[PDB]
Design a protein around this ligand. Structure first.
Ligand code: NA
Ligand code: NA
Ligand code: NA
Ligand code: NA
Ligand code: NA
Ligand code: NA
Lengths: 218, 212
């Protein structure tokens, strides 16, 4: 079970430094290579640099000039990325990924889930969570409104409810804040008996919001 | 630097079809290229490296070939699960560079949306704003029209739409339309309706609630 996990998403103020960490499990960073890659819709995937721990040798994409450095911690099985003088152009999903090097060939066999980092001159704000009350199948959801920056994670009943869940892409409001909805379709039989709570997690703000959704009454 | 040109940027295919994605390198890269699958909302996973060596554990339906500058990823027996974006990566020379990716979509039988409307929360209405949501669930094709009507008068300008990526199971889409108003203007009217037009519906479906 080789697994990789980047630091939690967050906000980076303009001109300050972007810092991330990848926690590696199932493999030692004392072998093979360790990369940071970022992804944007318009720019696609961008390789940032690779890192070899035993010799502490580092190879960076020149396009980042000398804003970037990659280091490790061999007893904690962590490696990190730092990117100074952060700018709006650095907003992206950052991936940590292992790279294997056999002969002349190099490829990325294990990627992390990726973490969104938003560069902004504004401040974090937690979401307001409102219910989408229902009414043989019914639909209900949560309205995660007015939060900054992206993203928010949404579960239902602490992960117990999975089938039929749709968490829509966030929308940018004239507010400058993001808003999305998460819906789930359940048997109409279970509305009065079963309880439905959406677990919203806004890691950029370290704000968790839990909201129950019931049919409005008289 | 090496420039990777990938084509097509997007394609649509039916279940069981064979799809081919191409990446063209700015110069010979002597088979130092790998391919990756990235399902919606997930991170990329390895498929092939060294241009044609299949990663152990990945289905044999994926195949890679190429020499010099031109490289191909071929995907046979297309299944709904294969909906994803596929990228190339050249490891010939640093900086490593990626193709722009090919978005692979699935063609399926027409499926009609299940429509639902949600009135504003009483909680939010206390704060002074009202959000009405209309949900179009599991439909295909992606094309759809949603028009808001308050007191059965067409409304425009105060709504924003959001659509999910194609479902990996049934290859369907879902859509949300959010009409947001001040509480004052929300209370100026009584009937709030969501008229939905779509291929799979005999006639436009209208779902409404009355305020009170
Ligand atoms: Na190589
Ligand atoms: Na964003
Ligand atoms: Na919304
Ligand atoms: Na060149
Ligand atoms: Na297409
Ligand atoms: Na309510």
């Amino acid at each position: 079970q080789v697994q990789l996990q980047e630091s939690g998403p967050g906000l980076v103020k303009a001109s300050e430094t972007l810092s991330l960490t990848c926690a590696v499990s199932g493999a030692s960073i004392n072998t093979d290579y360790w990369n940071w890659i970022r992804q944007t819709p318009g720019k696609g995937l961008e390789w940032i640099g690779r890192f070899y721990v035993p010799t502490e040798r580092t190879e960076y994409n020149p396009s980042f000039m000398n804003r970037v450095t990659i280091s490790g911690d061999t007893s904690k099985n962590h490696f990190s990325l730092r990117l100074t003088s952060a700018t709006a152009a650095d907003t992206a999903v950052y991936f940590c990924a292992r790279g294997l090097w056999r002969g002349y060939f190099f490829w990325v066999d294990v990627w992390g889930p990726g973490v969104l980092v938003t560069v902004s001159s504004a401040s974090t704000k937690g979401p307001s969570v409102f219910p989408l009350a229902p009414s043989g199948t019914a639909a209900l959801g949560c309205l995660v409104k007015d939060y900054f920056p992206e993203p928010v994670t949404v579960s239902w009943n602490s992960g117990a409810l999975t089938s039929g869940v749709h968490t829509f892409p966030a929308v940018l409001q004239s507010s400058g804040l993001y808003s999305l909805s998460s819906v789930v379709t359940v048997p109409s039989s279970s509305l009065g008996t079963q309880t439905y709570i959406c677990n919203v997690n806004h890691k950029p703000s370290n704000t968790k919001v839990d909201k129950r959704v019931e049919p409005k009454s008289c | 630097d090496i420039q990777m040109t990938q084509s097509p940027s997007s394609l649509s295919a039916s279940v069981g079809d064979t799809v081919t994605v191409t990446c063209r390198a700015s110069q010979g890269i002597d088979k130092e290229l790998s391919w990756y699958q990235q399902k919606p909302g997930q991170a990329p996973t390895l498929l092939i490296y060294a241009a044609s060596t299949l990663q152990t554990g990945v289905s044999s339906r994926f195949s890679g070939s190429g020499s010099g500058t031109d490289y191909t990823l071929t995907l046979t027996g297309l299944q709904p699960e294969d909906v994803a974006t596929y990228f190339c990566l050249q490891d010939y020379s640093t900086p490593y560079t990626f193709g722009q990716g090919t978005k692979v979509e699935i063609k399926r039988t027409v499926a009609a949306p299940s429509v639902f409307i949600f009135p504003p929360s009483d909680e939010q209405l206390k704060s002074g704003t009202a959000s009405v949501v209309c949900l179009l669930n599991n439909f295909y094709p992606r094309e759809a029209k949603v028009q808001w009507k308050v007191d059965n008068a067409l409304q425009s300008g105060n709504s924003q739409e959001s659509v999910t990526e194609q479902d990996s199971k049934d290859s369907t889409y879902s859509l949300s339309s959010t009409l947001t108003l001040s509480k004052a203007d929300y209370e100026k009217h009584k009937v709030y309706a969501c008229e939905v037009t779509h291929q799979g519906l005999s006639s436009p479906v209208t779902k409404s609630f009355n305020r009170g």
